[PDB]
């Protein structure tokens, strides 16, 4: 959104609605706040207890919208999908520990919402093969993490240029 190719496609569609002889064709633009990748990489990287030798797993090509700019260490604990039923079915205590979940059956934002209510620090989301059968194991993806909808930095009122933000 907001890229140049979006605006070229919008000029193409807005040309088509003129060429098909619609009764009236109109455009409506407004300014929003999204989140995009930084020029520095974000990584997930195994730390030994010694603090001496440091091993890395991936520089993920895909990112999550509306996350926080941070960096943390700690224990990792598997959770099924991040249902609230899952977190209350677990044996290991959740708090103070990064979690991993599998994508599917719930929006990303409710996974992060439940893992935030149980006081965890980190969330890593992946795709297993059983729910998602594919061949290419080195593949990345995308999701918004905002619970609720709309541009979050203007809730309730619209994001035009009359609000002065």
């Amino acid at each position: 959104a907001g890229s140049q190719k979006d605006e070229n496609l919008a000029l193409y569609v807005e040309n088509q609605f003129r060429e098909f002889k619609l009764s009236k064709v109109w455009r409506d633009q407004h300014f929003v706040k999204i989140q995009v990748k930084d020029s520095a990489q974000n990584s997930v990287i195994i730390v030994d207890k010694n603090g001496r030798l440091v091993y890395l797993v991936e520089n993920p090509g895909g990112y999550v919208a509306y996350s926080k700019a941070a960096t943390v260490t700690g224990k990792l604990v598997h959770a099924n999908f991040g249902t609230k039923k899952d977190f209350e079915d677990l044996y290991t205590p959740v708090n103070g520990s990064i979690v991993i979940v599998r994508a599917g059956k719930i929006t990303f934002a409710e996974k992060v919402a439940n893992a935030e209510s149980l006081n965890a620090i980190g969330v890593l989301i992946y795709m297993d093969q059983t729910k998602f059968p594919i061949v290419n194991a080195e593949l990345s993806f995308f999701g918004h993490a905002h619970l609720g909808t709309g541009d979050p930095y203007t809730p309730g009122f619209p994001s035009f240029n009359h609000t002065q933000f």
């Binding site: 090509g61 895909g62 599917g104 795709m127 729910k131 998602f132 059968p133 594919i134 290419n136 593949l139 990345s140 993806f141 995308f142 999701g143 909808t149 709309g150």
Partner: protein, 55 residues
């Protein structure tokens, strides 16, 4: 969802969906090549979905 729940407009959505959900849907491999590999007859199905929205 914001038409139904926030505004109060009756909203409707539909899909011809296989039992397991579509694998590469928010993905860098979502493209027309692998799409026509999954669905071998895309023209007829798109004809059906446009027919339903026409009704």
């Amino acid at each position: 969802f914001p038409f139904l729940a926030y505004s109060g407009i009756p909203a409707v959505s539909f899909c011809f969906c296989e039992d397991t959900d579509y694998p590469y849907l928010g993905t860098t491999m979502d493209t027309y090549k692998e799409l026509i590999e999954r669905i071998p007859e895309l023209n007829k199905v798109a004809r059906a979905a446009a027919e339903v929205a026409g009704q």
